[PDB]
């Protein structure tokens, strides 16, 4: 599966630059990105982010540029919802770019 | 009538307080001998969503 | 010079990776399940 399907049929999307399927190549990379970006939210916890925000808020307080609406880390449930959304978006978009570039070229 | 005046603005000095080095309003000071008689109200809510807390006379300073 | 026989692997590999693991696992499991007097 990995060699004769993914590696062999990815040639169309990886070689689309300079053509009309170039967008599928860009989306193929962008989708691999969104998917990896989801792992930050899926593997982390709000406790760490809240503290990091505290030190950033300090810099905004020091320069008198701190917002009245207090910055807060995403809720635990929101953290999980953001992670799954970016995981599905990235993963499905990656297959989408791979499928459309491959089929349009060898259709 | 010990304690800061009601309606006055004081700065919290309790280190573990969310409003440390922050200013709130003196809601009321319990003349009875309670450990923390100064009731202070704050505009910004803490992580728990609370906007009020009790502090001792020493934990507060006019500011 | 300090050279083991040709059968070495035919015997050492079986013992180390199958027999010894089983013996180790047996004694270890017993100790953990044992309760303090």
């Amino acid at each position: 599966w990995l060699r004769d399907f993914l590696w062999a049929q990815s040639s169309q999307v990886i070689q689309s630059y300079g053509s009309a399927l170039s967008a599928y190549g860009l989306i193929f990379l962008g989708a691999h990105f969104v998917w990896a970006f989801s792992l930050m939210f899926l593997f982390s916890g709000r406790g760490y982010w809240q503290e990091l925000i505290e030190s950033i808020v300090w810099a905004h307080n020091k320069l008198k540029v701190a917002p009245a609406i207090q910055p807060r880390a995403l809720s635990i449930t929101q953290g999980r919802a953001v992670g799954v959304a970016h995981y599905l978006l990235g993963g499905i978009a990656t297959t989408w770019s791979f499928f459309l570039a491959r089929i349009i070229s060898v259709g | 009538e010990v304690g800061p005046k009601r309606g006055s603005l004081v700065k919290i000095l309790r280190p573990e307080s969310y409003w440390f080095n922050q200013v709130g309003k003196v809601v009321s000071v319990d003349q009875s001998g309670v450990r923390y008689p100064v009731v202070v109200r704050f505009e910004n809510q803490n992580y728990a969503g609370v906007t009020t807390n009790n502090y001792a006379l020493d934990e507060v300073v006019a500011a | 010079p300090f050279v083991p026989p040709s059968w070495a692997p035919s015997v050492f590999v079986p013992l180390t990776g199958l027999v010894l693991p089983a013996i180790a696992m047996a004694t270890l499991f017993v100790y953990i399940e044992k309760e303090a007097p």
């Binding site: 300090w58 020091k62 320069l63 008198k64 701190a66 917002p67 009245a68 | 409003w19 440390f20 080095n21 | -």
Partner: protein
């Protein structure tokens, strides 16, 4: 010139890349009739390509062995060898725009903070005030220096919250 690079104007790889690019566009311009909208579009891209290769060379950009323009970021080399429109001037252009946004936003937050409900003015933007500050942001650099010199830009540590330590 610098780093062993060569002017794009004298690079052979730069010239071959321009031909390679125009030959792809020309191979496609053939399958279409001369006045066909497709033909007009491919021609305008070919003209834009010719202007880019010419404009880049005229700007005195240097090209590596790849035949592609390389940017000089050392202030000393850029000024002495005519390469300041590549990173230096862009730097002061961005810094002006970025400080403009920051100083205006800071001025807005400070203005809405003295109101009844600052949080409300952050979800519902006081457009008139926002537009006023947006226009007055052109002289931010001098205002920022004047605030830095009056000691009004920063906050006193005694008024800023911190953890127990």
């Amino acid at each position: 010139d610098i780093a062993g690079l060569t002017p794009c104007s004298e690079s052979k790889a730069y010239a071959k890349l321009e031909k390679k690019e125009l030959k792809t566009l020309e191979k496609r311009l053939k399958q279409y009739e001369a006045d066909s909208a497709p033909a007009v579009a491919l021609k305008a891209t070919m003209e834009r390509t010719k202007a880019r290769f010419a404009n880049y060379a005229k700007a005195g950009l240097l090209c590596g062995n790849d035949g592609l323009p390389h940017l000089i970021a050392d202030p000393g080399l850029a000024l002495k060898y005519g390469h300041a429109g590549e990173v230096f001037i862009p730097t002061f252009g961005f810094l002006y725009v970025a400080g403009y946004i920051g100083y205006v936003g800071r001025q807005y937050l400070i203005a809405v903070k003295g109101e009844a409900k600052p949080t409300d003015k952050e979800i519902i933007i006081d457009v008139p005030l926002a537009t006023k500050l947006a226009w007055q942001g052109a002289g931010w650099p001098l205002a920022a220096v004047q605030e830095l010199q009056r000691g009004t830009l920063l906050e006193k540590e005694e008024n800023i919250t911190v953890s127990p330590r």
